[PDB]
Amino acid sequence: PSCVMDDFRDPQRWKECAKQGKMPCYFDLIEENVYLTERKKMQCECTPLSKDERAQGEIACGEDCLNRLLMIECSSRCPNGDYCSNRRFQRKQHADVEVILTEKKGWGLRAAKDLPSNTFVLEYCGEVLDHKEFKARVKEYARNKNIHYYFMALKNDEIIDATQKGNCSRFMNHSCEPNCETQKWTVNGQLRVGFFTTKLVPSGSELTFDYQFQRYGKEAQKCFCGSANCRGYLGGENRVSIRAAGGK
């Protein structure tokens, strides 16, 4: 079974598909991170493209854009205005990906077209927790006997939790030999995490990243990535404390 990202926009139809096993379980689809506690909180120097350069296919704020080079997105005030290609997170310029049911990892993501190297896939959106809120969620999810975990360290005191609210990025599985990576980008002075391919991903291939998982649980989940260099377990050999996993 597989589904497209537009299938997640209709909660009633999705909930019915989920009951038949044709879609993953329902969660709250969000367009950007939601902070449980709000925290205290830049033009590039690109020369604007002329209309002829735009017509000829020149890229606005491409590889030489100072903001892009520092993993900062441009705002609406960019010298290239509407044409700026460095607003991918804000404009939801996602890769063409489908959500698929895997043999033993749960649901996952696959490329629906060939994806060039260094292509933005999706932003890892969720609820952003502080350390107190994180520990509360650790206990809740352990009490609920959850199998899948969706915590991602954003900063030392910001953990993204995509368990209850997020987007289809929450389906990207771990691989010990991955084809994607996280990148931390600044958008409106705030940090976000996106997934980007690290190589050409052929159409139909599962998209994976290396979680570098910090396991606090007593038991480690076996890794089913299938790589010749598989580490055997999500989290590797060592168990860490809850405090260490949460970034101190």
């Binding site: 352990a142 954003l154 990576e181 990148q183 998982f213 989940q221």
Partner: peptide, 14 residues
């Protein structure tokens, strides 16, 4: 001491 759980750590692929 939870049975399962942990935190994903972003890093640049090398």
């Amino acid at each position: 001491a939870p049975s399962t759980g942990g935190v994903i750590k972003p890093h640049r692929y090398r």
